Amino acid sequence: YSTSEQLVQLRIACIKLLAIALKNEEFATAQQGNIRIRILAVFFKTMLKTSPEIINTTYEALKGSLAENSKLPKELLQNGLKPLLMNLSDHQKLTVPGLDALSKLLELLIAYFKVEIGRKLLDHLTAWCRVEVLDTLFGQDLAEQMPTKIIVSIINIFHLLPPQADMFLNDLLLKVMLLERKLRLQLDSPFRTPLARYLNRFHNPVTEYFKKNMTLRQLVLFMCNIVQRPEAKELAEDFEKELDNFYDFYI
């Protein structure tokens, strides 16, 4: 815990200077070409470290480092996410930092434009909604438990999933509300702010969905609590042009 702490600080100092050492043109680039590829290899290896205070400055270093474009992604992108999308495959017993790294990585959208991350990871959202998994909650509380933290982290990446069209508008919040009843939890959640992050993204399918299914009092009541929180901004100002349709539907 002394060599561990100083190991962390030394390691992030190194990761700090590799991007600054990439920043000078015709010294980093002109040195044999394939050195900055081989430093992006050590970044993409150090996006599976189990301490967050390395991961945050690897991303904060890498987005400024890769702010200049790279002609890299046909050697290292098969290596840079093989254990990580192996950790996105249904291991079924995932971790907390394995998702926290994935939110930082797949923000950066190249060469994975398929959407089956929500398929296998929605299957994680169904299989962490079994009977025996929710059986161990049942007396001991919310977020501090393990399935609450990993389900919250499962939900908090649909924000940064790419914004092509939702196959995951209906069934996702139907299973979220079905969890809201199957843990009889109301007035707040461990997961509404991640689901508010998902809700602050589309606004054309979801206000139409909030025109279609309006007699469900739990859905309307659920959508009220999302809007009040300051993370929600243009659903807060997007229902405000919809007050004159609510009258016509309910009247």
- Which residues, 6+ apart, have CB-to-CB distance to 8 below 8 Å? 51, 53, 54
- The answer to whether 76 and 66 have CB atoms below 8 angstroms apart is no
Neighbours of 13 (CB within 10 A): 10
Take residue 63 and report the two structure tokens written for it: 């987005």
- The answer to whether 249 and 214 have CB atoms below 8 angstroms apart is yes
Take residue 77 and report the two structure tokens written for it: 């992108």
The distance of Cα 108 from the centroid of its chain, to the nearest Å, equals 12
State the Cα–Cα distance between residues 179 and 148, nearest whole angstrom: 11
State the Cα–Cα distance between residues 115 and 131, nearest whole angstrom: 28
Resolution (A): 3.7
State the Cα–Cα distance between residues 99 and 153, nearest whole angstrom: 6
The distance of Cα 184 from the centroid of its chain, to the nearest Å, equals 25
Neighbours of 206 (CB within 10 A): 19
State the Cα–Cα distance between residues 120 and 232, nearest whole angstrom: 27
